Amino acid sequence: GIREKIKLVSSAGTGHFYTTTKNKRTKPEKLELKKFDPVVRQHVIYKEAK
């Protein structure tokens, strides 16, 4: 699309990801969030966000 949606991926080399929607018309900024990885069984920073 053109509004886009976030697909934030595990930093532990896992294929695991999370999804979220975030408005860009207020400000454009990349998300740096800490989330659970069920394959290495820890909470880590997730990458490749919008």
Partner: protein, 64 residues
């Protein structure tokens, strides 16, 4: 012509070992970010039809 199976019902229902009919959920494949994950997990097991619609589905699928 000899009374027909509604194929728009056949591709939407399977029959259970108790006479009732089992089906999928709507609003689940085009928007996925708008339900919280508790609601997401409770919409991974499927559903069965209630009496308010069974009394019509059992006539649209007469040979089921």
């Amino acid at each position: 012509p000899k009374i027909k199976t509604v194929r728009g019902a056949a591709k939407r229902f399977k029959k259970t070992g108790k006479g009732g009919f089992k089906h999928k959920h709507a609003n689940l494949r085009h928007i996925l970010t708008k339900k919280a994950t508790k609601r997401k997990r409770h919409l991974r097991p499927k559903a069965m039809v209630s009496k308010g619609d069974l009394g019509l589905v059992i006539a649209c699928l007469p040979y089921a």
